[PDB]
Short mmCIF file of C-alpha atoms in Angstrom, two decimals:
data_model
loop_
_atom_site.label_atom_id
_atom_site.label_comp_id
_atom_site.label_asym_id
_atom_site.label_seq_id
_atom_site.Cartn_x
_atom_site.Cartn_y
_atom_site.Cartn_z
CA UNK A 1 0.12 -0.05 0.08
CA UNK A 2 1.10 3.89 0.19
CA UNK A 3 -0.34 6.96 0.98
CA UNK A 4 -2.47 8.61 -1.90
CA UNK A 5 -3.67 11.58 -0.27
CA UNK A 6 -1.96 11.67 2.93
CA UNK A 7 0.98 11.84 0.67
CA UNK A 8 3.15 14.88 2.64
CA UNK A 9 2.73 13.83 6.41
CA UNK A 10 1.45 17.42 8.23
CA UNK A 11 1.08 19.20 11.33
CA UNK A 12 -0.78 16.62 13.63
CA UNK A 13 1.12 17.14 16.77
CA UNK A 14 -1.97 19.43 17.75
CA UNK A 15 -4.26 16.38 17.07
CA UNK A 16 -1.85 14.28 19.23
CA UNK A 17 -3.68 12.46 22.40
CA UNK A 18 -3.76 13.98 25.41
CA UNK A 19 -2.77 17.34 23.85
CA UNK A 20 -6.15 18.96 23.39
CA UNK A 21 -8.06 15.75 22.48
CA UNK A 22 -8.82 13.46 25.23
CA UNK A 23 -7.16 9.96 25.67
CA UNK A 24 -7.71 7.19 28.16
CA UNK A 25 -5.69 3.81 28.88
CA UNK A 26 -8.38 1.73 27.93
CA UNK A 27 -8.94 2.92 24.15
CA UNK A 28 -6.22 2.98 21.80
CA UNK A 29 -5.13 6.30 19.55
CA UNK A 30 -5.90 6.23 15.97
CA UNK A 31 -2.95 7.50 13.68
CA UNK A 32 -3.99 10.80 12.15
CA UNK A 33 -2.31 9.97 8.89
CA UNK A 34 -4.27 6.60 8.30
CA UNK A 35 -7.68 8.42 9.31
CA UNK A 36 -7.42 11.16 6.88
CA UNK A 37 -6.36 8.34 4.16
CA UNK A 38 -9.09 6.44 4.79
CA UNK A 39 -11.45 9.27 4.41
CA UNK A 40 -10.47 10.88 1.16
CA UNK A 41 -10.51 7.65 -0.37
CA UNK A 42 -13.69 7.21 1.11
CA UNK A 43 -14.61 10.65 -0.30
CA UNK A 44 -13.20 9.66 -3.97
CA UNK A 45 -15.67 6.72 -4.25
CA UNK A 46 -18.91 8.90 -3.82
CA UNK A 47 -20.81 9.67 -6.98
CA UNK A 48 -20.71 13.61 -6.60
CA UNK A 49 -19.25 15.96 -4.34
CA UNK A 50 -19.83 18.35 -1.41
CA UNK A 51 -20.65 18.17 2.27
CA UNK A 52 -20.72 14.60 3.65
CA UNK A 53 -22.88 13.12 6.81
CA UNK A 54 -20.27 10.98 8.24
CA UNK A 55 -21.08 8.25 10.93
CA UNK A 56 -18.99 6.14 13.33
CA UNK A 57 -21.35 3.26 14.77
CA UNK A 58 -18.45 2.06 16.94
CA UNK A 59 -17.06 5.31 17.95
CA UNK A 60 -15.17 4.48 21.23
CA UNK A 61 -13.57 7.41 22.87
CA UNK A 62 -14.52 9.70 19.74
CA UNK A 63 -11.05 10.40 18.99
CA UNK A 64 -11.15 9.14 15.52
CA UNK A 65 -14.24 11.00 14.46
CA UNK A 66 -13.56 13.81 16.57
CA UNK A 67 -10.01 13.99 14.75
CA UNK A 68 -11.63 13.82 11.22
CA UNK A 69 -14.05 16.40 12.60
CA UNK A 70 -11.62 18.92 13.06
CA UNK A 71 -9.19 18.15 10.08
CA UNK A 72 -11.93 18.17 7.06
CA UNK A 73 -14.57 20.37 8.53
CA UNK A 74 -15.07 22.41 5.43
CA UNK A 75 -15.92 18.56 3.80
CA UNK A 76 -18.54 17.90 6.53
CA UNK A 77 -22.25 18.74 6.74
CA UNK A 78 -22.46 17.04 10.21
CA UNK A 79 -21.10 13.82 12.15
CA UNK A 80 -22.79 10.93 13.82
CA UNK A 81 -21.18 9.17 17.04
CA UNK A 82 -22.75 5.78 18.15
CA UNK A 83 -21.82 2.76 20.29
CA UNK A 84 -23.30 -0.10 22.46
CA UNK A 85 -21.36 0.49 25.38
CA UNK A 86 -22.17 3.67 27.49
CA UNK A 87 -18.68 3.54 28.92
CA UNK A 88 -16.68 4.82 26.37
CA UNK A 89 -19.46 7.36 25.21
CA UNK A 90 -18.27 9.62 28.42
CA UNK A 91 -15.33 9.90 26.93
CA UNK A 92 -16.49 10.54 23.00
CA UNK A 93 -18.52 13.32 24.67
CA UNK A 94 -16.09 15.58 25.89
CA UNK A 95 -14.12 14.82 22.61
CA UNK A 96 -16.94 15.86 20.33
CA UNK A 97 -17.75 19.26 22.42
CA UNK A 98 -14.27 20.13 20.72
CA UNK A 99 -16.49 20.33 17.28
CA UNK A 100 -17.47 23.83 18.75
CA UNK A 101 -15.50 27.12 19.07
CA UNK A 102 -16.54 26.91 22.94
CA UNK A 103 -15.53 23.69 23.51
CA UNK A 104 -12.08 24.17 22.30
CA UNK A 105 -12.25 27.79 24.48
CA UNK A 106 -12.72 25.79 27.69
CA UNK A 107 -10.35 23.32 26.65
CA UNK A 108 -7.56 26.06 25.89
CA UNK A 109 -8.71 27.80 29.24
CA UNK A 110 -8.31 24.44 31.46
CA UNK A 111 -4.70 24.21 29.69
CA UNK A 112 -4.01 27.82 30.68
CA UNK A 113 -4.95 27.46 34.54
CA UNK A 114 -2.64 24.17 34.63
CA UNK A 115 0.13 25.98 33.36
CA UNK A 116 -0.09 28.75 36.17
CA UNK A 117 -0.34 26.05 38.90
CA UNK A 118 2.08 23.89 37.76
CA UNK A 119 4.10 25.94 35.04
CA UNK A 120 4.85 22.86 33.14
CA UNK A 121 6.03 24.18 29.25
CA UNK A 122 3.69 21.50 27.87
CA UNK A 123 0.50 22.78 28.71
CA UNK A 124 1.06 26.24 27.42
CA UNK A 125 1.80 24.27 23.93
CA UNK A 126 -1.20 22.51 24.59
CA UNK A 127 -3.31 25.93 25.06
CA UNK A 128 -1.78 27.56 21.85
CA UNK A 129 -2.76 24.01 19.96
CA UNK A 130 -6.54 24.72 20.92
CA UNK A 131 -6.60 28.14 19.97
CA UNK A 132 -5.19 27.31 16.46
CA UNK A 133 -7.46 24.11 15.97
CA UNK A 134 -10.56 26.78 16.93
CA UNK A 135 -9.31 29.11 14.65
CA UNK A 136 -8.73 26.69 11.81
CA UNK A 137 -12.63 25.65 12.66
CA UNK A 138 -14.12 28.84 12.68
CA UNK A 139 -12.47 29.59 9.34
CA UNK A 140 -13.95 26.51 7.97
CA UNK A 141 -17.54 26.73 9.04
CA UNK A 142 -17.26 26.83 12.49
CA UNK A 143 -19.27 24.65 14.87
CA UNK A 144 -19.60 21.54 13.31
CA UNK A 145 -23.47 19.69 14.19
CA UNK A 146 -22.78 16.43 15.87
CA UNK A 147 -24.93 13.93 17.34
CA UNK A 148 -24.09 11.07 20.03
CA UNK A 149 -26.21 8.11 21.17
CA UNK A 150 -26.10 4.80 22.29
CA UNK A 151 -27.25 1.74 19.76
CA UNK A 152 -26.30 -1.85 18.70
CA UNK A 153 -25.05 -2.11 15.37
CA UNK A 154 -26.18 -5.67 15.27
CA UNK A 155 -29.52 -4.78 15.81
CA UNK A 156 -30.65 -2.95 12.85
CA UNK A 157 -34.05 -1.60 14.44
CA UNK A 158 -31.80 0.40 17.02
CA UNK A 159 -29.99 2.03 13.74
CA UNK A 160 -32.93 3.85 12.65
CA UNK A 161 -33.37 5.59 16.10
CA UNK A 162 -29.40 6.60 15.84
CA UNK A 163 -29.75 8.57 12.52
CA UNK A 164 -32.61 10.66 13.71
CA UNK A 165 -33.86 11.26 10.00
CA UNK A 166 -30.43 11.59 8.71
CA UNK A 167 -28.66 9.96 5.90
CA UNK A 168 -24.88 9.07 6.10
CA UNK A 169 -22.93 9.29 3.17
CA UNK A 170 -19.82 7.69 4.47
CA UNK A 171 -19.57 5.38 7.49
CA UNK A 172 -16.00 4.89 9.11
CA UNK A 173 -15.32 2.81 12.38
CA UNK A 174 -12.15 0.89 13.65
CA UNK A 175 -13.46 -2.66 14.65
CA UNK A 176 -13.79 -3.04 18.58
CA UNK A 177 -10.95 -5.01 20.41
CA UNK A 178 -13.78 -6.87 22.17
CA UNK A 179 -15.25 -8.24 18.89
CA UNK A 180 -11.79 -9.79 17.94
CA UNK A 181 -11.28 -13.35 18.64
CA UNK A 182 -8.81 -12.62 21.13
CA UNK A 183 -6.89 -9.57 22.52
CA UNK A 184 -4.11 -10.35 20.03
CA UNK A 185 -5.30 -11.04 16.64
CA UNK A 186 -8.72 -9.50 15.00
CA UNK A 187 -12.51 -9.64 14.17
CA UNK A 188 -13.82 -12.73 12.21
CA UNK A 189 -15.80 -12.85 9.24
CA UNK A 190 -19.10 -14.00 10.62
CA UNK A 191 -19.51 -10.39 12.47
CA UNK A 192 -18.21 -8.42 9.66
CA UNK A 193 -20.63 -9.69 7.30
CA UNK A 194 -23.44 -9.43 9.79
CA UNK A 195 -22.22 -5.91 10.56
CA UNK A 196 -22.38 -4.78 6.99
CA UNK A 197 -25.47 -6.42 6.38
CA UNK A 198 -27.19 -4.15 9.47
CA UNK A 199 -25.53 -1.02 8.28
CA UNK A 200 -26.43 -1.08 4.82
CA UNK A 201 -30.08 -1.47 5.43
CA UNK A 202 -29.99 1.67 7.26
CA UNK A 203 -27.93 3.42 5.10
CA UNK A 204 -28.79 5.38 1.36
CA UNK A 205 -27.62 3.29 -1.59
CA UNK A 206 -24.47 5.35 -2.49
CA UNK A 207 -22.81 5.01 0.87
CA UNK A 208 -19.54 3.76 1.39
CA UNK A 209 -18.58 1.99 4.40
CA UNK A 210 -14.78 2.20 5.46
CA UNK A 211 -13.84 -0.40 7.98
CA UNK A 212 -10.22 -1.00 9.92
CA UNK A 213 -8.79 -3.85 11.52
CA UNK A 214 -5.30 -4.49 13.11
CA UNK A 215 -5.52 -7.80 10.81
CA UNK A 216 -3.55 -7.96 7.55
CA UNK A 217 -6.69 -8.57 5.15
CA UNK A 218 -10.36 -8.32 5.96
CA UNK A 219 -12.94 -10.94 5.04
CA UNK A 220 -15.93 -9.22 3.40
CA UNK A 221 -17.00 -11.98 1.01
CA UNK A 222 -19.37 -12.78 -0.57
CA UNK A 223 -19.58 -8.90 -0.72
CA UNK A 224 -16.88 -7.37 -3.40
CA UNK A 225 -14.65 -4.86 -2.26
CA UNK A 226 -14.43 -1.70 -3.66
CA UNK A 227 -10.99 -1.23 -2.44
CA UNK A 228 -8.09 -2.49 -0.01
CA UNK A 229 -5.34 -1.34 1.73
CA UNK A 230 -2.59 -2.25 4.56
CA UNK A 231 -0.57 0.32 6.11
CA UNK A 232 1.88 -1.14 8.75
CA UNK A 233 -0.02 -3.14 11.34
CA UNK A 234 -3.69 -1.78 10.16
CA UNK A 235 -5.75 -2.98 6.75
CA UNK A 236 -9.05 -1.34 5.42
CA UNK A 237 -11.58 -2.35 3.15
CA UNK A 238 -14.20 -0.13 1.53
CA UNK A 239 -17.69 -1.17 0.48
CA UNK A 240 -21.02 0.18 -0.95
CA UNK A 241 -24.37 -0.16 0.70
CA UNK A 242 -25.88 -1.26 -2.73
CA UNK A 243 -23.35 -4.23 -3.18
CA UNK A 244 -23.72 -5.37 0.37
CA UNK A 245 -27.60 -5.38 -0.05
CA UNK A 246 -27.01 -7.67 -3.42
CA UNK A 247 -25.71 -10.59 -1.56
CA UNK A 248 -28.20 -10.56 1.10
CA UNK A 249 -28.79 -13.33 3.57
#
């Protein structure tokens, strides 16, 4: 594989976990460069162009979705976050709050107080980082509409509820570690195909679905992949909602 879009690695130090965006020891960070690569490749498979509604149905800590929201604000009409556990969502809520200028301002001011209290130079680098992101956010559209809800991705009846009328164009998600066969492996194909089938039942026909795993190749069949990649430890497959529906039960 290679970087088609993320061709020249850019300033993502502001988007590093724990600087402005929130981290937690239980949820892993996603590589900034890999995220913006999967997303632009997803965009290039859509019929026409314009602002896209983006959904992450296993949003975990919201880091991946928030990162995309700030980086690609101009290509985004709105973002949807969802997951089954209420655990990570408490964290995703504080990450998604950074998709508005006012959330970035509170983060900024929090870092300035810690800087005064502790004098650590890293707190000020953080504060300037938040300011910079908020100025970019503002110039690219300002506050980015988002919604977060709990919902089971294998229960397609629940999916209607999450979307709340919206019709996502791109679905993007890192498969969760609890669905993996063990901690040190990958999510198997029986759940992958049940996952697509459930999603596409709720999506518009043109929607692109981008899934990522720690494996070397993701078993989507019988469905026909639109595209694949591996970068380092990670691999991704992109499928169209219409194609999923064909293969059926």
